[PDB]
Each structure stands twice: as C-alpha cells, then as structure tokens.
Amino acid sequence: MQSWYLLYCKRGQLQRAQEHLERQAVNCLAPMITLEKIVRGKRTAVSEPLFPNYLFVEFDPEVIHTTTINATRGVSHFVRFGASPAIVPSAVIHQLSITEGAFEGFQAIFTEPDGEARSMLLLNLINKEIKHSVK
DNA sequence: GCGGTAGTC
C-alpha cells in the first residue's frame, strides 16, 4: 500500500531528487519552517528546511521498488529501521500538517532553531514511534 | 560506493 519513507539526499541534490522522484510518481515532502534567526546581527524571519537534506516520500513498495528509489538521481539513502527502510508512521506525517510521543517530539522539533538538531530529533522520534507499534 | 531512476558492478 502507499507508505511514507524518509530519504537523505546527496549534498545539494535535494531539488534534483525531488525532481526525479516526482517524475516516477513518488510523492515528495520537504517541509519548511519559518522562524526568527539572526542575519547581519539583526533578528529577522527566515524560511529554511525543517530537516536539511531530508525528504519524506510516499510510494507503494509493491508498485515501485525501494531498490528503484535507492537508485534515483539525487538520493543518498533511506533512513532505516534495522536493515530495511523505516516506514514513517502516518501519525508522524500528520504532525507536519497523532501520537503522544509524536505530538511532543514535534513540539520539541518545532521549537529547535538548528536544522541538524531538528533532524536528529526526527530520527529519534521515528525510531521510538516505530518501536511503539511493535508487539 | 558510485551512479543510479542498477549493478551477469
């Protein structure tokens, strides 16, 4: 069925990966966040990638193979849970536009002004939320 | 790992 995954893109190739993935009918998602940063010693508002160089993608792994995504121009790799691509729970995706760990994990993400910290937070939250869906 | 929308690489 349609599932969401999380890819890392090659340095500066994100827009390229979005291109080639969308060409293959894979839905792409690279959320931005508007926040107050310092620019020329003045506090101002900027829009920047919520999770730099990461891209959420949605496709049916029975229609398009992960090996095909893993060979798409611009793509570096899947975020994995174990040895296989992490399937990002939809509750996580929903918080970009629900679980308690998810909810609070994103409260932390949305208030973290450094993108690399936001991504680290993201990876941890996806790990935790997937483990929580196990028996 | 690269180059790849893979790989009798």
Author numbering: 1 to 97, 118 to 155
What does the literature reporting this entry say, word for word?
In addition to housekeeping NusG, diverse bacterial paralogs, typified by E. coli RfaH, activate long operons that encode antibiotics, capsules, toxins, and pili by inhibiting Rho-dependent termination, an activity inverse to that of NusG. RfaH-CTD, unlike the CTDs of all other known NusG/Spt5 proteins, which adopt a β-barrel structure, folds as an α-helical hairpin that masks the RNAP-binding site on the NTD. RfaH is recruited at ops sites in vitro and in vivo through direct contacts with the non-template (NT) DNA strand in the transcription bubble, a target shared with σ. Contacts with the ops element in the NT DNA are thought to trigger domain dissociation, transforming RfaH into an open, active state in which the NTD can bind to RNAP; consistently, destabilization of the domain interface enables sequence-independent recruitment.
To visualize the molecular details of RfaH:DNA interactions, we determined a crystal structure of RfaH bound to a 9-nt ops DNA encompassing bases G2 – G10 (ops9) at a resolution of 2.1 Å. The DNA binds to a basic patch on RfaH-NTD opposite the RNAP/RfaH-CTD binding site and forms a hairpin structure. The hairpin loop comprises G4-A7, with T6 flipped out so that its nucleobase is completely exposed. Flipped T6 inserts into a deep, narrow, positively charged pocket on RfaH-NTD, which is mainly formed by H20, R23, Q24, and R73 located in helices α1 and α2. RfaH-NTD exclusively contacts nucleotides in the loop region, involving K10, H20, R23, Q24, T68, N70, A71, T72, R73, G74, and V75. Base-specific interactions with RfaH-NTD are made by G4, G5, and T6; however, only G5 and T6 form a hydrogen-bond network with RfaH-NTD that may underlie sequence-specific recognition. Thus, contacts between only two nucleobases and four amino acids mediate specific recognition of ops by RfaH. The stem of the DNA hairpin is formed by base pairs C3:G8 and G2:C10, with T9 being flipped out. The G2:C10 base pair is likely an artifact of crystal packing as the stems of neighboring DNA molecules stack on each other and could not form in a TEC that contains a 10–11 nt bubble. However, this idea is refuted by our observations that domain interface remains intact in the binary complex, implying that additional interactions with RNAP or nucleic acids relieve autoinhibition.
